From Swiss-Prot:
Catalytic activity field: 5,6-dihydrouridine(20) in tRNA + NADP(+) = uridine(20) in tRNA + NADPH + H(+); 5,6-dihydrouridine(20) in tRNA + NAD(+) = uridine(20) in tRNA + NADH + H(+); 5,6-dihydrouridine(20a) in tRNA + NADP(+) = uridine(20a) in tRNA + NADPH + H(+); 5,6-dihydrouridine(20a) in tRNA + NAD(+) = uridine(20a) in tRNA + NADH + H(+)
Organism: Thermus thermophilus (strain ATCC 27634 / DSM 579 / HB8)
Sequence positions that bind FMN: 9-11, 62, 131, 163, 192-194, 214-215
Protein name per its UniProtKB record: tRNA-dihydrouridine(20/20a) synthase
SUPFAM superfamilies found in the cross-reference section: FMN-linked oxidoreductases (SSF51395)
Length: 307
C-alpha cells in the first residue's frame, strides 16, 4: 500500500464515474468509494453498489457500521469485488451516523472498535484501515487521540487517515497528525483537511506518510495534474483535452450499458476550471446533459487549444 496520495471518500461525489475521471488525471493516486453502510452491502444490490472498473485500482472501499460480524461480512463482500483495501469510517458525525451508531460515535467505545477491527482484519487478506477525526468537539486532547490510535493498532491496524479537525468551528490541527507520526513511527499516517494544492500536500508529506485531498479535487480535478510526476515519479502528464476525449469514450459506452448520461456528466463540469472557455464547457454540459452536448463542448475546446 502506497499511502502517499489519495482522494477522499465523498458521498454523492466519489462514485465510480468521478473516480474513473480522476484516474485519467493521475494513475498513482489512491481512490476511495463513498461511505457505504454495511447494511446496504448486506441487503442491497451488491453489483450496483460495489462494482467498479479495473482501471480504478488502487481503490479502497469505505464501510460504516457498528457490529463486528456485520462489518466483517461486508468486508468479505468488498474483497470479493476486488477492492484493494477496506477502510472503516470512524469520523462521520452526521445525524444519520448517530442514530445508526456508527462513524464518530464509535470512538466513545474503544473496546467495541477494537473488536470490530480484529473481526474485519481476520475476515479479509487485504489491508483494513481507518479514517477518523481528531476527536469529539469539547473533549479533544492529544492524549485521547493517541490512546485511540494505540488501541486500534493493538487490533492490527497500520494505516490511519486522520481528518485533522474535531467533529460536531474547531481549527485544523495537522500538527497533531505530525505528532502522531513521531509517537508511532511504525504506523502509517495520512493527514486530511483543507489541503488545496499539490504544493500544500508536499509540505505535509515532509512530516507524515500521506495526504488525502477531497474538496479541492472535486472542485478542480487537475489540482492533481502533476501528482504522477512529482509524487509518484511517473513520466506522465495528463492534458485536459485528452482526459475529456477519454471521458467521451467512457460516456458513450456507459450510456449504451444503461447509465443515465447525467450520472457521468455531472462530474465533468469542472474539468476546465480556470481555463479559456471553462464556463462555456460547464454550461454546455449542464444544459445538454447528453453525449451530443459533450461532443459539441469537445469541438469548441479542441478549436480553443489546438494540438
Ligand atoms: C460532499 C462530501 C462528502 C463526504 N463524504 C464522506 C464520506 O463518505 N466518508 C468520509 O469518511 N468522509 C466524507 N466526507 C469528509 C471528507 O472525506 C474529508 O475528510 C473532508 O472533506 C476534509 O478533507 P478536504 O478538506 O480535502 O475536503 C465528505 C466530505 C464532503 C465535502
Amino acid at each position: 500500500l502506497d499511502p502517499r496520495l489519495s482522494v477522499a471518500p465523498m458521498v454523492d461525489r466519489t462514485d465510480r464515474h468521478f473516480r474513473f475521471l480522476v484516474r485519467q488525471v493521475s494513475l498513482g493516486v489512491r481512490l476511495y468509494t463513498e461511505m457505504t453502510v454495511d447494511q446496504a452491502v448486506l441487503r442491497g444490490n451488491r453489483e450496483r453498489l460495489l462494482a467498479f472498473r479495473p482501471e480504478e485500482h488502487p481503490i479502497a472501499l469505505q464501510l460504516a457500521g457498528s457490529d463486528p460480524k456485520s462489518l466483517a461480512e461486508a468486508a468479505r463482500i468488498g474483497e470479493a469485488f476486488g477492492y484493494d483495501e477496506i477502510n472503516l469510517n470512524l469520523g462521520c458525525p452526521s445525524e444519520k451516523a448517530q442514530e445508526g451508531g456508527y462513524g464518530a460515535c464509535l470512538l466513545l467505545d474503544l473496546a467495541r472498535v477494537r473488536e470490530i477491527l480484529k473481526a474485519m482484519g481476520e475476515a479479509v487478506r487485504v489491508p483494513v484501515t481507518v479514517k477518523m477525526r481528531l476527536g469529539l468537539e469539547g473533549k479533544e486532547t492529544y492524549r485521547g487521540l493517541a490512546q485511540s490510535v494505540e488501541a486500534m493498532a493493538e487490533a492490527g491496524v497500520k494505516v490511519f487517515v486522520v481528518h485533522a479537525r474535531s467533529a460536531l468551528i474547531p481549527p485544523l490541527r495537522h500538527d497533531w497528525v505530525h505528532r502522531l507520526k513521531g509517537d508511532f513511527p511504525q504506523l502509517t499516517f495520512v493527514t486530511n483537511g483543507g489541503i488545496r494544492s499539490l504544493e500544500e500536500a508536499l509540505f505535509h508529506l515532509k512530516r507524515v506518510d500521506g495526504v488525502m485531498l477531497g474538496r479541492a479535487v472535486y472542485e478542480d480535478p487537475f489540482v492533481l495534474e502533476e501528482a504522477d510526476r512529482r509524487v509518484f515519479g511517473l513520466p506522465r502528464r495528463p492534458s485536459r483535452l485528452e482526459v475529456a476525449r477519454r471521458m467521451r469514450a467512457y460516456l458513450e459506452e456507459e450510456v449504451l450499458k444503461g447509465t443515465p448520461p447525467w450520472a457521468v456528466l455531472r462530474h465533468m463540469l469542472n474539468l476546465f476550471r480556470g481555463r479559456p472557455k471553462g464556463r462555456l464547457w460547464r454550461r454546455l454540459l449542464s444544459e445538454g446533459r447528453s453525449l451530443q452536448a459533450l461532443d459539441r463542448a469537445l469541438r469548441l475546446m479542441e478549436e480553443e487549444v489546438g494540438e
